[PDB]
Structure 1
Amino acid sequence: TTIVALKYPGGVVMAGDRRSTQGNMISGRDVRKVYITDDYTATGIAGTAAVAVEFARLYAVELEHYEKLEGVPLTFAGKINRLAIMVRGNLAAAMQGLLALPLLAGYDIHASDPQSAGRIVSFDAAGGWNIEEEGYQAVGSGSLFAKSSMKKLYSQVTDGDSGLRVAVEALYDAADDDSATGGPDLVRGIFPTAVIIDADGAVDVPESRIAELARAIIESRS
């Protein structure tokens, strides 16, 4: 697994692969690891797959639940706190094996300068969190590789499509070194998923522009 989030002028992008390893034996090649939580929040989750789809799904309901109740979405501050609680209330499990570690990406519609309204918040197994303020972050089996490649390719981030390419290139760079990450599968037509968030909202990036982007990176390296 490798999830990665990027901050560009307009807002933020987040994309993660779809491999699923059990031992050193592939057991999935199509897993959705990144989900849209609400209009301006997307969340990717690494570790145990069972807790993964559950966090995303449950969180999303809690956010919308607050909105329907109080009539207004939570502060970005709130959104961060709720997710943080959720993670702590799972330490018991995580201790034994069921470890699920989120990565939050969002757009603060209330941020002072709505060109820095892109947010990336990484999370701690114990329930901690730091607002990244460094443009890129990654969590997972090969995040270490992504973060280190993405370090070089960050200058290249200019805008939406610009940033997205660096994301997809890190995920490729990761999978190239972490056997548990899994890069773009041409033979089968399986490509990492992605979500972008700007002032307009958060939307799934169609595999089309990703698959295209993927081949760009493959050929250029070739």
Structure 2
Amino acid sequence: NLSSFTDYLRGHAPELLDLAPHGTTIVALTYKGGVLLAGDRRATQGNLIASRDVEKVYVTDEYSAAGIAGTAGIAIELVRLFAVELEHYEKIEGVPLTFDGKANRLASMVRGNLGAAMQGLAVVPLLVGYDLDADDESRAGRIVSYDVVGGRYEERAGYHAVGSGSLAAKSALKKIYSPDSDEETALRAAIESLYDAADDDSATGGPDLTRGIYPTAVTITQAGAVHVSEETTSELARRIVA
């Protein structure tokens, strides 16, 4: 009634707002064309590996997507709802939300989970997108990070990451990354830091050539977001290796 799918639940169906299968690392990079996300696929509850093919990055809408790190269960439902929060606002208003809108909404949804956060079951996302309303379509890609209490933060440094191996990846990128670059160079630097994060972090564990486990990726541009193929990643991580 404010075009918020969520707010409709708020008033008509409130029941929708390591004991259980954890998180992983996710990276975000900015570039010439637009932006992208790449995240590990290993879910770990305890020191035990629970799944090695879990997708952590989802395409929220035509021109944006996000990866969430934290309690898998709480993080899944949260992104799905975000997606719908977005799509519904369009169908209703006819146009889509600003990118700064989509972010402020996602922030609200996070703020909502703070309760569960302070009880261990926390979750934090990373939001990226091609700002169709940015003046210079050169730097139209964006990265938003979050708090647990629901803060919204701007990247303004071309890259970021969240997860257990984030401190690692962030550092690798602090080296292997440079501004305006190919959507091939950045998809490269991502698989890289996603490799170093796995080196110094048993919770992550990036590209595993022996098993066939490859990082998931997604690139958004002036054309929209699309999920990179399993081929463009494996023959891409093989290149990274030495």
Aligned-CA RMSD value: 1.0
Give the corresponding residue for 1:24: 47
User: Which amino acid in structure 2 is aligned with residue 140 of structure 1?
Assistant: G
User: Which amino acid in structure 1 is aligned with residue 152 of structure 2?
Assistant: W
Question: Pick from 64, 67, 76: which aligns with 2:87?
Answer: 64
User: Which amino acid in structure 2 is aligned with residue 27 of structure 1?
Assistant: A
Task: Check conservation: 1:2, 1:143, Cα contact below 8 A.
Answer: yes
Over residues 23-77 of structure 1, what are the superposed CA-to-partner deviations in whole Å (9 max), with x where a residue is unaligned?
A: 1111110010000000111110001000111111110001000000000100111
Q: Which structure has the larger Rg over C-alpha atoms?
A: 2
Task: Check conservation: 1:147, 1:170, Cα contact below 8 A.
Answer: yes
Task: Check conservation: 2:34, 2:140, Cα contact below 8 A.
Answer: yes
Query: Scaled by the length of structure 2, what TM-score is found?
Result: 0.89
Give the corresponding residue for 1:97: 120
Give the corresponding residue for 1:88: 111
Change (3 A) 1:209 1:157: farther
Which ranges of structure 2 fall in alignment gaps of 5 or more residues? 1-23
Name the CA distance, whole Å, in 1 between partners of 2:179 and 2:102.
30
Give the corresponding residue for 1:55: 78
Give the corresponding residue for 2:38: 15
Deviation at 1:116, TM superposition (A): 0.6
SS for the counterpart of 1:73 is coil
Deviation at 1:155, TM superposition (A): 2.2
Does 1:106 pair with 2:158?
Answer: no
Which ranges of structure 1 fall in alignment gaps of 5 or more residues? none
Give the corresponding residue for 1:2: 25
Q: Identity across aligned pairs (percent)?
A: 67
Give the corresponding residue for 2:61: 38
Query: Scaled by the length of structure 1, what TM-score is found?
Result: 0.96
Give the corresponding residue for 1:187: 210
Deviation at 1:156, TM superposition (A): 7.5
